[PDB]
Amino acid sequence: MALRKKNSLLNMANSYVLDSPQPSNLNYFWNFGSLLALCLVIQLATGITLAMHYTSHASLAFDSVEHIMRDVNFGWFIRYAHANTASFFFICIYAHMGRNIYYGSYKTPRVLPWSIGVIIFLLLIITAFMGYVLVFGQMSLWGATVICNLVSAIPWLGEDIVHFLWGGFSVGNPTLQRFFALHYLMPFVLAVFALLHLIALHTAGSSNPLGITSNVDKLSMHPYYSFKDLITVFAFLLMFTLFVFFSPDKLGHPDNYIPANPMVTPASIVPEWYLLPFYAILRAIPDKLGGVIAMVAAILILLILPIVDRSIIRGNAFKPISKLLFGFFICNFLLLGVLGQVHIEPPFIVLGQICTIFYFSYFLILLPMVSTIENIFFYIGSL
Amino acid sequence: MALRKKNSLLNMANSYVLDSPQPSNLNYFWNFGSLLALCLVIQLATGITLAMHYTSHASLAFDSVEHIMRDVNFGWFIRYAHANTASFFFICIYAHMGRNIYYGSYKTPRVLPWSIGVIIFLLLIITAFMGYVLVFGQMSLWGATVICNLVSAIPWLGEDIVHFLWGGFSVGNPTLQRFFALHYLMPFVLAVFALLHLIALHTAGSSNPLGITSNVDKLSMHPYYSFKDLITVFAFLLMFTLFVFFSPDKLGHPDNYIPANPMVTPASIVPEWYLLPFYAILRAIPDKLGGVIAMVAAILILLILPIVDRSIIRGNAFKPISKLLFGFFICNFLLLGVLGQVHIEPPFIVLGQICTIFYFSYFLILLPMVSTIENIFFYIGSL
Amino acid sequence: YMGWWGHMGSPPQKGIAGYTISPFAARPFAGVVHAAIFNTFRRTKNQALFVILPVSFFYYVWTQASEKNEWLYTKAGRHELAKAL
Amino acid sequence: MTAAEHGLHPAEYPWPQNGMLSTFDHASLRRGYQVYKEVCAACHSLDRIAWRNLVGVTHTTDEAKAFAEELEYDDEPDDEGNPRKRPGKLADYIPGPYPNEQAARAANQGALPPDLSLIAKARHGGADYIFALLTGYPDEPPAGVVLAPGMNYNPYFPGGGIGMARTLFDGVVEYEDGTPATTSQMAKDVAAFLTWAAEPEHDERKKLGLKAIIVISAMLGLSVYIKKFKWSPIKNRKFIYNPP
Amino acid sequence: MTAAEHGLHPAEYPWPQNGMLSTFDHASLRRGYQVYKEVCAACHSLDRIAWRNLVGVTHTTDEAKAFAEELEYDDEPDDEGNPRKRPGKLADYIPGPYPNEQAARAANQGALPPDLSLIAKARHGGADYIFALLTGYPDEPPAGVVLAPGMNYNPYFPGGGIGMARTLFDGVVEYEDGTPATTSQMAKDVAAFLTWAAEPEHDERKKLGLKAIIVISAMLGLSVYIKKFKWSPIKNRKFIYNPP
Amino acid sequence: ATTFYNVFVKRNSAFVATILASAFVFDMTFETAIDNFWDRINAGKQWKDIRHKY
Numbered sequence A, B: 001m002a003l004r005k006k007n008s009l010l011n012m013a014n015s016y017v018l019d020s021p022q023p024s025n026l027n028y029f030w031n032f033g034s035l036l037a038l039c040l041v042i043q044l045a046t047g048i049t050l051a052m053h054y055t056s057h058a059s060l061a062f063d064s065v066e067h068i069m070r071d072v073n074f075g076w077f078i079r080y081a082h083a084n085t086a087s088f089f090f091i092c093i094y095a096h097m098g099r100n101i102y103y104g105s106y107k108t109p110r111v112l113p114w115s116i117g118v119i120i121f122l123l124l125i126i127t128a129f130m131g132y133v134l135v136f137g138q139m140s141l142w143g144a145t146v147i148c149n150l151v152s153a154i155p156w157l158g159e160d161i162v163h164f165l166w167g168g169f170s171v172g173n174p175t176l177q178r179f180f181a182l183h184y185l186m187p188f189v190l191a192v193f194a195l196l197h198l199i200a201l202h203t204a205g206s207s208n209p210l211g212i213t214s215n216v217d218k219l220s221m222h223p224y225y226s227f228k229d230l231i232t233v234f235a236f237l238l239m240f241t242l243f244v245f246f247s248p249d250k251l252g253h254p255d256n257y258i259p260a261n262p263m264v265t266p267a268s269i270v271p272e273w274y275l276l277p278f279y280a281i282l283r284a285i286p287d288k289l290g291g292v293i294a295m296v297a298a299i300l301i302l303l304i305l306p307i308v309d310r311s312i313i314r315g316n317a318f319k320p321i322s323k324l325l326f327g328f329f330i331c332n333f334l335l336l337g338v339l340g341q342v343h344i345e346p347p348f349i350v351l352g353q354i355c356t357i358f359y360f361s362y363f364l365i366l367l368p369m370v371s372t373i374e375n376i377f378f379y380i381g382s383l
Numbered sequence C: 001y002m003g004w005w006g007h008m009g010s011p012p013q014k015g016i017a018g019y020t021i022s023p024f025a026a027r028p029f030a031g032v033v034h035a036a037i038f039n040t041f042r043r044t045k046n047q048a049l050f051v052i053l054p055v056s057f058f059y060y061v062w063t064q065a066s067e068k069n070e071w072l073y074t075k076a077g078r079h080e081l082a083k084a085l
Numbered sequence D, E: 001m002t003a004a005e006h007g008l009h010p011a012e013y014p015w016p017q018n019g020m021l022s023t024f025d026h027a028s029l030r031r032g033y034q035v036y037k038e039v040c041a042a043c044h045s046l047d048r049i050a051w052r053n054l055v056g057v058t059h060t061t062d063e064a065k066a067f068a069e070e071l072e073y074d075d076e077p078d079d080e081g082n083p084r085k086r087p088g089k090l091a092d093y094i095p096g097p098y099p100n101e102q103a104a105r106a107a108n109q110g111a112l113p114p115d116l117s118l119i120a121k122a123r124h125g126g127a128d129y130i131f132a133l134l135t136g137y138p139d140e141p142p143a144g145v146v147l148a149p150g151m152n153y154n155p156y157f158p159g160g161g162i163g164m165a166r167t168l169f170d171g172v173v174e175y176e177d178g179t180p181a182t183t184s185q186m187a188k189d190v191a192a193f194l195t196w197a198a199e200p201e202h203d204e205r206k207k208l209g210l211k212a213i214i215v216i217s218a219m220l221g222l223s224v225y226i227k228k229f230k231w232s233p234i235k236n237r238k239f240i241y242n243p244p
Numbered sequence F: 001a002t003t004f005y006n007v008f009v010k011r012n013s014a015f016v017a018t019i020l021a022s023a024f025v026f027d028m029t030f031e032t033a034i035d036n037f038w039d040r041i042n043a044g045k046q047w048k049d050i051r052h053k054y
């Protein structure tokens, strides 16, 4: 017996990266998983390095980031790589989740990897939110203030919880130092959950774009998907290069180059772009607690896709109506993103409410109805 | 089929903590593994918490530790727990390694868990060394200075490497900030290697005090060893309590309550007690490079136990001569520890050299000879 | 629902003969020009409506909303803005 | 929001540094330093820039040492523990005009002139905003605009009323390289200098980016060949089925 | 090393706080504060202690506020950005006698009096060392000892020559509680106070430790019963072998 | 082609040695070539171009 199979440690690596039996027809949308692993590796390498030069104390934090930019050899690169890769991480994660929804990757027997995946997504949001605060610029401070004040909506104990989270009566030094410690930790937790969702997946194997079994026709992960992953790695690195070296501040907010000032409020307080759709959903509900619930529900509702999809067929490749509905759902999600950064003004207030209703009605009404009707059309249409 | 067996994630936990088949005769020396896991959990919880209040900048580090002691609610407890548990971690690890050597846990088929274990031990040393520097008291600074200067012995590039490690021309702010980042990281690396050595062990299962197969007579890990582990958990917590609450500074050096001062050299620069035997071994060799090699070799030589033990029988329970040799080896290791903290004065200089020779001759001469002779005595004696 | 090599969980297979040639024996870019033009055109044409319809609808909606918002905050839009608030 | 509340958006000027392959014009950086030193430095600090940062960018080692040595900085206390001053060194940061915010605001009718070290990154528009703002004070505010006391009309500034008056007038500086110091010329130079101050790695970054682009593009092309090469047995597979 | 190079080891005195169940004597802490304030504070700082730390340990809220309010601390600059002083608050730290190290050394013939906030933890011996040092200046150095200029003989100090002279003499302090202020009494009180300053959690820590000891001991006893209960089928197992 | 294959490619030890040596050469020559190209497209603008005046 080959050593890679005989030795228990080598055999674990073997089972995931080499002999792992894959469908022979995975398309390029199956490459986002390895891009997410790449983003995670970049964030760990750059993040640990930034931590060697960063000071978490509020009197020194912003200045330590300027020290990184100006004095540390290649500090500018490490900082810009870390900041831009956070954005790329969300592009890849949305693409990965989009793939999963389009191709029915959430259906049995893959409910568990999908459900762990939803938690990974929440952990990424928390990770990125805390990392953004560490700069301690104007957007850092005011973003932290507004977002942490949402916890005040928890009935009875909310206010007490906020003061507990802050370690004081407003966002300050105690908050920054604890966000540093937790920002360092959370990526390790995220790596563990990423590993867990892959172990859960390994019982059924990868799905494929046709939605059928691949047990009939398997291909080794290596060399086929190893070399196919390299193409998207280099495409990713080209995109990375264009942002990091030629336009490093395109995705950021200029106000985060102003040191945090609790007195002066910035003109507009918006989250980073990748949180904007959830911010639009929150704004749509007039009630404070209502808004918070809706915002959380917008993510947790992903957990019910296995139930509300009533199709007897996995994925959308052969479902014209479900493909149209998916297209509208995705574009609506992008419009929500845009509406998250407009001013609270007519006519965007009502538009945000309509888009929020559409977002939820996809899960609760449209997908159950469309999937039921398509079942009937497949049966009658082929009689 | 029971869910704990059916579900792949639950089944992994099941295989390690519940259905795991154990020998029925493990004695209390098999409890150090779970105590080490407890130390690791305590260090993670207390360490992450300290990181929420600690400032890694050299101008603020020592003061941030005083802030923890004085202002943070239960900060004194979290700090003392972290400092004392570092010592308990080494007591438990020496006990665990002692068990492994006495009972032949390094022999085939357990060479791989033992070899990974040797790396865990090295990672613990590095972790603890860097954490000690973070206080930035006198012992922190001067300990870092002398230990990092050992790297200057690497031929040709040694000096350049030291300046690279320091981030400057002496131990200062850059050094402190990078030690913080790496001190945070290293326990996660250590946890991974701890998991790896257990996965490697799972192919053969635990050894047992008789050195025979346990395949004939297995007990479930739970409830038997779960409840047996609780006894030593509470014995450990009693010891912990006596140090943390009643004598929190007994294991420490008073000079670490003096802020680092590059001008004033402390009366005696000694490592923490758990590193003292290796320091004595270093002193024994007059050459700088020689000393560094000997010190590293004193740990790496553990890797050859599987080769130099020529016994046809696993472990020492039935080997009177091996037991006596083991006793002398252990006591010699303790004497080396004591000699690591005496002044470099007669007659301790020569004694340290004799003890160093004895340390190495155990692996290279005595164990191969004694184990060869005992083989013959077993055979002839039982004819 | 998935086994491993040798027992993958396929229904029994019989009667299929599979053939292929070595990567060293093949032209990796055979028919690349035809594929790049004609295959891509076919592939894109068949999916075009599923992208065009939602993109064009949501872009139209955005355009109308952003133009109205802009107009409401001019002098000319004063009265309509007062009603809208 | 009203356009006035946003501020007029600055034109896109063709900066020498615009362009994937373009550095700053260092002659313009040097002239812009001189504008900073003779005009802006009366009210604005540049606290993140040390004298050493100018060296090999705008000035020689000797010129920058001369600038540092003209100033006095706080030394370590003497042997009786009394305060002392020393001459500046290359390691020293360029000193600001005011000891604190309160002194800054008192000298500027309540307004606080920001530190200019990051101003090119801290405002939408960057160099274009700085240029537009400095050159965009109309002689007369548009009819109907009511300025608050100590405010000046500038359409580029959000709200229109800025606490900074126009400061650049033809010939307020005499450039040492003979360049005519018009309002426009000085604004262009100082905007370039401040852009450099915000991103001093700019030139090196773009050159390393060129190298990365080339290597990564070549690797992308080769990875396509290698993928297609390895996959061709799978792509080329043919079947004959004879139903059992 | 010689015993002289090490310093004489201090006696073990029976402190009230010695004893697993014993707190500090707070009356001694209060008296020791008074010794600090009237004797040691001329040369030594206590920088880690704030006025609020005395409250409910040695002093009432009002007494500590009165101590703070007698002093002047640096305020934020006024509206013209000029420096200002304010009266002290409970949040303020106890101010030291010297502005810097250089001033401290100049006043003490080159020697630097350490901050006393951690001194009980920063020396082997703790309270015993402080007590022994303060009370251990012999009238005459042992015959043959050559003291360096500005040094005083004290056997407890490593090397024997200390830059601090004897300072405690009978009646240098008049205690407010009527206690006779002898050298020994003052040394005992100030050593207790400094021990508290180094470890202010001491009293609470030991009480929580008592609770932990009790709970953990009971849990240890119960875990033994439960282990033995669960293991008895294995321990009690019997075999009959009939060779096949 | 046979000769080239036999010497530099057939043995992986030799192939890897050839790749690494080529990477070394590439790295040094590419550096020099980019430096010169960068200086030509940004002629007159860089410090090195105005340094002589001072």
Ligand code: HEC
Pocket: D035, D036, D039, D040, D042, D043, D044, D108, D111, D112, D113, D114, D116, D119, D123, D130, D133, D134, D157, D161, D162, D163, D164, D165, D167, D190
């Ligand atoms: C004598 C005073 C004075 C001089 C001279 C001066 N400034 Fe200012 N500047 C100010 C004040 C006051 C503000 C704050 C204005 C406000 O916020 O209302 C300001 C604001 C600015 C801003 C930020 C506007 C914003 O968007 O917040 C920039 C950029 C600026 N100045 C650049 C310059 C440059 C470049 C020069 C000269 C070459 C210059 N200043 C000369 C007083 C001055």
Ligand code: HEC
Pocket: E035, E036, E039, E040, E042, E043, E044, E108, E111, E112, E113, E114, E116, E119, E123, E130, E133, E134, E157, E161, E162, E163, E164, E165, E167, E190
């Ligand atoms: C007028 C000067 C002066 C007075 C009064 C004074 N000290 Fe000191 N003290 C010093 C100097 C100077 C040193 C440093 C001696 C040396 O390092 O040689 C010192 C050192 C010490 C040390 C540390 C000795 C060591 O081991 O390093 C302690 C503890 C101490 N003093 C406590 C006190 C206490 C308690 C009091 C009064 C109740 C006191 N001192 C009064 C000047 C003074």
Ligand code: HEM
Pocket: A040, A043, A044, A046, A047, A048, A049, A050, A051, A054, A065, A079, A082, A083, A086, A089, A124, A127, A128, A129, A131, A132, A133, A134, A135, A183, A184, A187, A190
């Ligand atoms: C999933 C992985 C991670 C994500 C998504 C992430 C995200 C972010 C973001 C968005 C920022 C703000 C960047 C900026 O605008 O300047 C940031 C800053 C930071 N992150 Fe992370 N991060 C990750 C991992 C890590 C890790 C593992 C560390 C290890 C300490 C770390 C350390 C830092 C530090 C020190 C900063 C502040 C300095 C700076 O702003 O660049 N990060 N992170």
Ligand code: HEM
Pocket: A029, A030, A031, A032, A033, A034, A036, A037, A040, A093, A096, A097, A100, A105, A106, A110, A113, A114, A116, A117, A118, A120, A121, A190, A194, A197, A198, A201, A205, A206, A207, A208
């Ligand atoms: C750190 C983030 C993540 C990483 C590194 C990661 C990685 C991967 C990898 C490597 C795969 C197998 C290859 C592939 O299909 O792309 C995979 C599959 C999957 N992931 Fe993720 N993932 C992450 C986040 C998520 C999230 C947020 C979700 C869901 C909300 C998710 C759900 C899934 C599912 C359902 C599959 C199986 C898809 C299939 O093959 O049909 N993952 N992931």
Ligand code: HEM
Pocket: B029, B030, B031, B032, B033, B034, B036, B037, B040, B093, B096, B097, B100, B105, B106, B110, B113, B114, B116, B117, B118, B120, B121, B190, B194, B197, B198, B201, B205, B206, B207, B208
């Ligand atoms: C973080 C440190 C460590 C942890 C948490 C840990 C944990 C454990 C656990 C739980 C076991 C199984 C139960 C037991 O025998 O006690 C075990 C077994 C073992 N460990 Fe460790 N260990 C650590 C460090 C080490 C080190 C430093 C070595 C070797 C130099 C080592 C070598 C072994 C070996 C050889 C076994 C098998 C012993 C046998 O059953 O015969 N471990 N370890």
Ligand code: HEM
Pocket: B040, B043, B044, B046, B047, B048, B049, B050, B051, B054, B065, B079, B082, B083, B086, B089, B124, B127, B128, B129, B131, B132, B133, B134, B135, B183, B184, B187, B190
């Ligand atoms: C194997 C696990 C660990 C060991 C053996 C260890 C060991 C140590 C040691 C010996 C010190 C010096 C303690 C003192 O005398 O004050 C220390 C300090 C510190 N450690 Fe750890 N540590 C571990 C894990 C961690 C982790 C996971 C963190 C997370 C950040 C951490 C954070 C700290 C911090 C912030 C300090 C400095 C504050 C202080 O001295 O208490 N440690 N550590």
Ligand SMILES: CCCCCCCCCCCCO[C@@H]1O[C@H](CO)[C@@H](O[C@H]2O[C@H](CO)[C@@H](O)[C@H](O)[C@H]2O)[C@H](O)[C@H]1O
Pocket: A005, A008, A011, A012, A013, A014, A015, A016, A017, A019, A199, A202, B008, C003, C004
């Ligand atoms: C992704 C990075 C690479 C590192 C590997 C990831 C670490 C996770 C591995 C631990 C999880 C246990 O992983 C589990 O391992 C065994 C053997 O290794 C696999 O078992 C599989 O392969 C082996 C042979 O290769 C067969 O005996 C078995 O029939 C098959 O199911 C499981 O399908 C996988 O779920």
Ligand SMILES: CCCCCCCCCCCCO[C@@H]1O[C@H](CO)[C@@H](O[C@H]2O[C@H](CO)[C@@H](O)[C@H](O)[C@H]2O)[C@H](O)[C@H]1O
Pocket: A008, B005, B011, B012, B013, B014, B015, B016, B017, B019, B198, B199, B202, B203
């Ligand atoms: C100790 C910490 C607790 C967490 C457990 C550690 C998490 C990572 C462990 C997974 C690594 C893979 O570990 C591997 O798992 C499989 C199934 O789970 C075990 O497999 C074992 O149990 C299952 C049933 O319980 C049997 O089918 C199999 O015959 C047997 O070998 C392997 O013996 C173990 O080596």
